[PDB]
Amino acid sequence: TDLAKELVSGAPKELITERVARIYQEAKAATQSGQHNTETWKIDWDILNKGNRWENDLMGYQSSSDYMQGTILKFDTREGAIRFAKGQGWDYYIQEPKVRRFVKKDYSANFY
Amino acid sequence: PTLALTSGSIQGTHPEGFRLPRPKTWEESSESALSKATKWYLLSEIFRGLYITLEMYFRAPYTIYYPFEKGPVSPRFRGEHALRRYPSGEERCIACKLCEAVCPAQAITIEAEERIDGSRRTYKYDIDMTKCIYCGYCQESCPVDAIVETPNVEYATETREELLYNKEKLLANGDKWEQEIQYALDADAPYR
Amino acid sequence: SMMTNEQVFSLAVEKLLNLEVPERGQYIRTLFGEITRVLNHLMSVLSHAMDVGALTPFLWGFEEREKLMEFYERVSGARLHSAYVRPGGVSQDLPAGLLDDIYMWATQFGDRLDETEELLTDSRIWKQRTIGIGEVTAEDALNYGLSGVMLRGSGVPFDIRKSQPYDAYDKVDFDIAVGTKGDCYDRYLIRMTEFRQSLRIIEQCCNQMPPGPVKVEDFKVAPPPRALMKEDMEALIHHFLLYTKGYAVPAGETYTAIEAPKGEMAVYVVSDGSERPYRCKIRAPGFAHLGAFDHIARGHFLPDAVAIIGTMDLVFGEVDR
Amino acid sequence: FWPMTFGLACCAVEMMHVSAPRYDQDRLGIIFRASPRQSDIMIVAGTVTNKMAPALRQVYDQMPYPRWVISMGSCANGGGYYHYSYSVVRGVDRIVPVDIYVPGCPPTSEALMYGVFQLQKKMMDGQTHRMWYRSY
Amino acid sequence: QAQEILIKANKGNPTGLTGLFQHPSPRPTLITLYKATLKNLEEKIPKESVYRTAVEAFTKERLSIVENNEIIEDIEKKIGSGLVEELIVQANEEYDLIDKMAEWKAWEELEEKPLDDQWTYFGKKL
Amino acid sequence: SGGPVPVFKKYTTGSKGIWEKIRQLLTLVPNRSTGNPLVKNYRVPPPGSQTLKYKDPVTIPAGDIVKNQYYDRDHRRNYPRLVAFDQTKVSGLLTLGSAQNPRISVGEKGQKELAVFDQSVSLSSTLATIDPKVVKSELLAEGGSPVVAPSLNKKMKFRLTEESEHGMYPEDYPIRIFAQN
Amino acid sequence: ATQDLPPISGYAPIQWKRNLPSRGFRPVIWFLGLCTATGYGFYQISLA
Amino acid sequence: SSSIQRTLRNLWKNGFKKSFKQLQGYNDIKSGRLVGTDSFGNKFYEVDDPVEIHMRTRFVEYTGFWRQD
Amino acid sequence: TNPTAFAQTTRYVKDSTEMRTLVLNLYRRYLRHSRGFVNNYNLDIPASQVRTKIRQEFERQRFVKDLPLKNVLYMKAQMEFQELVNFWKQQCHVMQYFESIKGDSFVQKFLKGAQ
Amino acid sequence: EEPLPVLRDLPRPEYGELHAPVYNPAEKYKEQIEELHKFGRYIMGCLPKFVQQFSVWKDELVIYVAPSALTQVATFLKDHTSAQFKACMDVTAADYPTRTNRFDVVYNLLSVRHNSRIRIKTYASEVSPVPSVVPLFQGANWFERETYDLFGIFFEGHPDLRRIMTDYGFQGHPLRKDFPTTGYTEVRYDAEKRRVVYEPLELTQAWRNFTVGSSVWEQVGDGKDFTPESFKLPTPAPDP
Ligand SMILES: CCCCCCCCCCCC(=O)OC[C@H](COP(=O)(O)OCC[N+](C)(C)C)OC(=O)CCCCCCCCCCC
Ligand SMILES: CCCCCCCCCCCC(=O)OC[C@H](COP(=O)(O)OCC[N+](C)(C)C)OC(=O)CCCCCCCCCCC
Ligand code: SF4
Numbered sequence A: 001t002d003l004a005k006e007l008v009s010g011a012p013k014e015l016i017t018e019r020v021a022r023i024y025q026e027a028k029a030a031t032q033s034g035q036h037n038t039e040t041w042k043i044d045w046d047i048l049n050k051g052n053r054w055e056n057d058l059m060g061y062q063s064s065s066d067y068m069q070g071t072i073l074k075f076d077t078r079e080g081a082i083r084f085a086k087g088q089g090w091d092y093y094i095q096e097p098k099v100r101r102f103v104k105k106d107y108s109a110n111f112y
Numbered sequence B: 001p002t003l004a005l006t007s008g009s010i011q012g013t014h015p016e017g018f019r020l021p022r023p024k025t026w027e028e029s030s031e032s033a034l035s036k037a038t039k040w041y042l043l044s045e046i047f048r049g050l051y052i053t054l055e056m057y058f059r060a061p062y063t064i065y066y067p068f069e070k071g072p073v074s075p076r077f078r079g080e081h082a083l084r085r086y087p088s089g090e091e092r093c094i095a096c097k098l099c100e101a102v103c104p105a106q107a108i109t110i111e112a113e114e115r116i117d118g119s120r121r122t123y124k125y126d127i128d129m130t131k132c133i134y135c136g137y138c139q140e141s142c143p144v145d146a147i148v149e150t151p152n153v154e155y156a157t158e159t160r161e162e163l164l165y166n167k168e169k170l171l172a173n174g175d176k177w178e179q180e181i182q183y184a185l186d187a188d189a190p191y192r
Numbered sequence C: 001s002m003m004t005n006e007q008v009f010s011l012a013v014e015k016l017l018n019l020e021v022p023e024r025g026q027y028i029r030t031l032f033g034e035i036t037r038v039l040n041h042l043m044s045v046l047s048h049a050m051d052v053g054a055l056t057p058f059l060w061g062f063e064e065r066e067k068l069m070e071f072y073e074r075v076s077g078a079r080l081h082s083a084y085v086r087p088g089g090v091s092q093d094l095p096a097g098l099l100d101d102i103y104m105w106a107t108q109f110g111d112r113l114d115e116t117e118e119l120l121t122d123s124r125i126w127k128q129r130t131i132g133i134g135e136v137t138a139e140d141a142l143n144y145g146l147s148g149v150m151l152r153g154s155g156v157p158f159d160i161r162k163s164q165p166y167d168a169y170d171k172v173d174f175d176i177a178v179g180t181k182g183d184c185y186d187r188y189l190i191r192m193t194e195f196r197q198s199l200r201i202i203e204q205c206c207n208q209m210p211p212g213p214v215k216v217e218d219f220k221v222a223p224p225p226r227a228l229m230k231e232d233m234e235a236l237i238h239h240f241l242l243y244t245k246g247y248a249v250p251a252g253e254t255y256t257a258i259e260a261p262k263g264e265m266a267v268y269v270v271s272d273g274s275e276r277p278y279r280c281k282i283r284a285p286g287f288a289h290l291g292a293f294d295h296i297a298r299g300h301f302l303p304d305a306v307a308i309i310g311t312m313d314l315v316f317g318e319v320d321r
Numbered sequence D: 001f002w003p004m005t006f007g008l009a010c011c012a013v014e015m016m017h018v019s020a021p022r023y024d025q026d027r028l029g030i031i032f033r034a035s036p037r038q039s040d041i042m043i044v045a046g047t048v049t050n051k052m053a054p055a056l057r058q059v060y061d062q063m064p065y066p067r068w069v070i071s072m073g074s075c076a077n078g079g080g081y082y083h084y085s086y087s088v089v090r091g092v093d094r095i096v097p098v099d100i101y102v103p104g105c106p107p108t109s110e111a112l113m114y115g116v117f118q119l120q121k122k123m124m125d126g127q128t129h130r131m132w133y134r135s136y
Numbered sequence E: 001q002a003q004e005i006l007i008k009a010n011k012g013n014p015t016g017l018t019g020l021f022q023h024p025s026p027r028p029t030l031i032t033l034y035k036a037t038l039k040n041l042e043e044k045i046p047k048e049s050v051y052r053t054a055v056e057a058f059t060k061e062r063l064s065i066v067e068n069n070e071i072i073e074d075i076e077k078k079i080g081s082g083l084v085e086e087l088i089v090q091a092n093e094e095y096d097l098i099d100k101m102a103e104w105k106a107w108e109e110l111e112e113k114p115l116d117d118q119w120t121y122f123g124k125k126l
Numbered sequence F: 001s002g003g004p005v006p007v008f009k010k011y012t013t014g015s016k017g018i019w020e021k022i023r024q025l026l027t028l029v030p031n032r033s034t035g036n037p038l039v040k041n042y043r044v045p046p047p048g049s050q051t052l053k054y055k056d057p058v059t060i061p062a063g064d065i066v067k068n069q070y071y072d073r074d075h076r077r078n079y080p081r082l083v084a085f086d087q088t089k090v091s092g093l094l095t096l097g098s099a100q101n102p103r104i105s106v107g108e109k110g111q112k113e114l115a116v117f118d119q120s121v122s123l124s125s126t127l128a129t130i131d132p133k134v135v136k137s138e139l140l141a142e143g144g145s146p147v148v149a150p151s152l153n154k155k156m157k158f159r160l161t162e163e164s165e166h167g168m169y170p171e172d173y174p175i176r177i178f179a180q181n
Numbered sequence G: 001a002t003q004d005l006p007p008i009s010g011y012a013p014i015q016w017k018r019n020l021p022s023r024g025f026r027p028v029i030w031f032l033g034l035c036t037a038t039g040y041g042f043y044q045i046s047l048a
Numbered sequence H: 001s002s003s004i005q006r007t008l009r010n011l012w013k014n015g016f017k018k019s020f021k022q023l024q025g026y027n028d029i030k031s032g033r034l035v036g037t038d039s040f041g042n043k044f045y046e047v048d049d050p051v052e053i054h055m056r057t058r059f060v061e062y063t064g065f066w067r068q069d
Numbered sequence I: 001t002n003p004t005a006f007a008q009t010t011r012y013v014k015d016s017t018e019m020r021t022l023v024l025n026l027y028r029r030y031l032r033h034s035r036g037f038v039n040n041y042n043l044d045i046p047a048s049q050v051r052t053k054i055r056q057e058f059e060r061q062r063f064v065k066d067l068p069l070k071n072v073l074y075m076k077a078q079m080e081f082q083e084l085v086n087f088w089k090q091q092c093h094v095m096q097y098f099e100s101i102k103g104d105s106f107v108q109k110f111l112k113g114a115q
Numbered sequence J: 001e002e003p004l005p006v007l008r009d010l011p012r013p014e015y016g017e018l019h020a021p022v023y024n025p026a027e028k029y030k031e032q033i034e035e036l037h038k039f040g041r042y043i044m045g046c047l048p049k050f051v052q053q054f055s056v057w058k059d060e061l062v063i064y065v066a067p068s069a070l071t072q073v074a075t076f077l078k079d080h081t082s083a084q085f086k087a088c089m090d091v092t093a094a095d096y097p098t099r100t101n102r103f104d105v106v107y108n109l110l111s112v113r114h115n116s117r118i119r120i121k122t123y124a125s126e127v128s129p130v131p132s133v134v135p136l137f138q139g140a141n142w143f144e145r146e147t148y149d150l151f152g153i154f155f156e157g158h159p160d161l162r163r164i165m166t167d168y169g170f171q172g173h174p175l176r177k178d179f180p181t182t183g184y185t186e187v188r189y190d191a192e193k194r195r196v197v198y199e200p201l202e203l204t205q206a207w208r209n210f211t212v213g214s215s216v217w218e219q220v221g222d223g224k225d226f227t228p229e230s231f232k233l234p235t236p237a238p239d240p
């Protein structure tokens, strides 16, 4: 836990001093009634304020310089995500998932 | 009861005759020393190998005279890509973005919107020929047979820029190669 | 050996998917599995002989590759990288007339093998370059993870097609050649026997090819036919989802191995219940063979190293996957 | 036309079939040489990795002039299947100048021969000695 | 005492396996290895060990077969674990394993328990 | 058996008339083919000009419009579950027996024994104090014989064959041929 | 009919076993020819 | 197929001008029955000679004399 | 199988005092091969600058306290040493290693775009 | 002298409506599942001190052990007469960042003797050492080098551990989940420096993440139970 495992991972120093990762649980999509994607905790990185995306003039391609733009880690528990982020010495913040309040729902309430 | 008593197995049991016989000595040769020396000194097998090679010298070769002659092709062959039209001239593609999703190399870029007349059409269809692996997944996934691969292979270019096909290049290829694509489709569509 | 590489990954996913290929599909992957093996041995043995100095057999057999690669292109449209064998069967059914063309080639391929052996098998120069070169003991072959001809050259009769039959290999009759001295010459003789045994299997597949579907009758894994796709609502949905999201595989792991022409090729695939593999470890027989090069080639001379490299059938895409 | 034996990956297999009896590149005067000194054509047939890129540049520099480079297959052209790989060069043109690009995965034996024919057409249009007379 | 016994011969007629030569004294070598194996079990490994129970069961079976069959082929055809030259190798390796098992003390409690989250994959505990 | 076949039975272009007689005289093996495919037989109908009318093959039990409920053939969702046996469950199977051969008391007296193996129970302690006949009958096989590693294919046997059968190199070459047996 | 299948009777058998028959005279005959050529060759050399 | 008699037959059927053009690009003297012409001007032939090999029964005559594409 | 030249057997050191000696022993090996590094890779700098560079890299991990991290750091340093001495690295890599090079103010980054 | 028949014109069989069995592919492994359960239990009984647990899936047996128990279990599975796994066909790893120990180190053994395969599973962290099975299996030398190169696992006792796949001086371990698929740097030829140099990664077209289109519904249920009846905890008889 306290071990600074980033000294041996080989990742560049910019992951620690310049990038911010978000630990979050995916919110339920408003267009679908499934909840499978909300059962896992994920880690992604905030975009670079400049150079995240720019248009290549030759073909209109989406050019980028962020090498972490397409990396999304998967975790089964919130504690596991925190332990891994702490182990790598990342600057992170946790977005607590919104919980749906339970309200009783019955067919009789359509008239009463 | 099995061979577990002796910690053995059927698979571990070597068949009869597995052990090699005793090797032969110099006194058990079938051929005489003079006979073995005649083959050895006169290079019996070397002249046999020479004779076989000379036989091919009087046989028909396999070479074909490209580009005056072409090798066999099949309707399933995958080559240069093209965008096809309906017989009325309307583009077949409805910008459904199936081919972009399947593409293992992510060589297809599609941008779409409502057409001026309201049709669901694309205004940007790019294929990186330097990135495509010519695998045919886009052709298989197309619900309207809009994107196909022609049997064409002779389109090598001086510059790498010319291998970045846009919608105009792909549509022009479809018009240019429409007749040859029709040949392949009429013979391969039943098998799909 | 492209189609054998697809077969081992296809078998791994099918085993994880708990699905079974239909009868005709299994025969097709068996027929092209041995056609692939003939293609690999043509590249392996002749290039091994070319490195030693026999240039002519390389040219003779590479025309036989052209005939066999035409079979690859007829059923898939790709001469070399034919994405034909897929999890759940094959991409497409055989075009009409393929079996007749395969059989007509089969009646003639026997003579090509004999003419190849005319220059190598009994040549005194060839035997001086292979006999006693790169000897591997049976004890050390197992300990270094050697497989296939490398393992069978040292006297160990082990073959995956017999140890763990797959894809209709249990319905054809063939033999395995086993060496005694464990050197390059024994491995050359084994690969020539495997040439004739593969031709023996190809003949049986042509005669015993059954009717029926070539892919699993399950549209949640196998794409539906195009004609059915454009008329059926459910077929369109399954076609749409198979190409956009793919099919999910139940969570778990597998280690599936096949008797590849190079040896034992295995894949360790980890599934997480999603449509993308979580981990795919590819086991390369050439990677293990080259790891024993130091133990095998020590004490030999420089030209012997070239023979040892050739006798291992090394393709460095497989090694460096 | 003497190319150099520089087979890297599966694209090299199709390059071997050009020398096969069916096409017989030797009938056009094409001989593959093992040394950069004796070769004037560099055919990049396979994937160029970062570990391999310095070796490719050194071999290219060891070819005496005049010299031409052919980029065959999606790997050499733009990386192909391994474009988004951490250890793959996205096009051999990042290291050496390319005279002709041959598309395909792999390009067929006739596709490579067509590219060679295009290069030979370009070579026949050279005006090296008339350039000295008129342009210099 | 000094009972120097040949395990793998470096010379002689081949057995069909590369690097494995014929053993000059097949039967006597196995008899000593089997009897020494049985004695070593009774002096190093306790009775409650399952490993000791299983080794004695098959070592005695292989010892009885060797002592009742003069023909080498009949010995292999009943043990079913390869040639006698291979059986000598197996006897030596099994004899050395008992010595390693005694040092390991592999019959005791689990030396290292796994963590609670150790053998869990994607939320399901195996 | 794949014995020698005459040249005219192979689908290759051959010689005719006097040139066939000359070939038989000069060639060491006259029955070998030249390897040139017959122009009048090989690939004469090209794949793009085949007259066959293809139809999608469908089996009855799994591709019919009746008696074809999908869940009856839904093998993917009926996959085997992943079960791991730790030393606690193995001790329970050893002490209480299995469901195939129950050795657990009845009623409430039996549920007390089951609740023992709901926490950590070492197998070494279980083996230390247990009837030895159980180990010889459950953990071991054939009255104490060790459990041999199970074969992946019990029909993987072999038999040594001679040249007159397999048609490969004679006995003086340093390889041998094993059949299925 | 609606698929690619082998004929009803099946395909005729093919040749796949080794076919490399020996050719030429016995080695003793070649040895005698060498001695006969050497004897006659030295005879003509001696005459010259 | 590589016999000199085949070349002499094709030389007679084609004539001097047709064969010399083949001797400049084709590296081979061939004759065949005309099948048709394309919009670019190329001519396409099919060979009925029994001595021709499998893959050499169809060929093209390009419009250009010194260069072919 | 014989290990290559300058190959060490990987070992996990459980004593902090012993680990210090191993680092010091490896530190001297780098200094002794500094001239060999200049000769083999044909560098544009004298061997004195190489030894300064080696000291700077070693001093970056001087204050590492965790023993498990030391074993990984020492193991990778041994692998790096073996790579350089055996001439496995290409000359371009070593040239770029020594081709490593006051920060800009807030406005200077602001005017150009910053990060 | 007879002409060869035209294979195209040969008559072909006529088939009606085809039939095919419908059964679970897991049914054919019923003998393999039970035999591996007994053999897996025999190993745990022989090594209660080392074998944490074992699992059986169809025809694949997996043994789970601690890093401190890897050498003993591998030695037992190599030299025991009933389990002669002389060949170590593969050594690999998998990354699970969720767990305290990220990596599962997997050993696939083959027994040509009894025609059997077995698997050994242990665990490791980024700094924890794993015993090297190179003294036992010489073929694991390159596999352990590959595992370290792509994961960074500390193999203690390896005679020569170094990179085997990545470029010389490569930074990072690609097969870790936090390692980006495109890496951090790329190479090009610098005309000024007359050599190939490494530069920070910039992509003309960024890799598009289409994996976010995964289904929002679970696709496979809880599955079917295929545990042998001889390996289920018994249910006590009901009340009198
Ligand atoms: C005349 C001068 C030119 C030829 C000189 C060399 C000829 C061979 C000498 C040794 C023969 C030998 O040793 O003969 C013995 C061998 C093999 O027969 P075997 O194994 O005993 O057969 C077994 C017993 N039978 C005979 C009852 C079946 O025969 C050969 O392989 C003959 C080779 C013939 C093909 C090549 C001939 C043309 C060569 C190319 C043109 C220059
Ligand atoms: C008295 C009559 C004199 C005859 C004169 C001619 C003698 C020729 C040499 C015979 C001995 C020999 O070829 O020997 C073979 C030697 C050494 O072989 P080795 O190591 O001893 O093993 C063999 C002995 N065994 C079986 C007892 C173990 O190597 C070679 O393969 C040399 C191959 C050279 C091939 C060159 C052919 C070029 C084309 C020629 C045709 C136009
Ligand atoms: S053929 Fe395959 S790789 Fe090429 S564009 Fe189509 S889907 Fe992409």
Ligand code: SF4
Binding pocket: B092, B093, B094, B095, B096, B097, B098, B099, B100, B110, B138, B141, B142, B143, B144, B145, B146, B147
């Ligand atoms: S799959 Fe066909 S219709 Fe859909 S976007 Fe691609 S080309 Fe257009």
Ligand code: SF4
Binding pocket: B133, C081, D009, D010, D011, D012, D045, D046, D047, D072, D073, D074, D075, D076, D080, D081, D104, D105, D106, D107
């Ligand atoms: S472009 Fe395709 S065929 Fe060529 S080397 Fe790359 S993957 Fe292989």
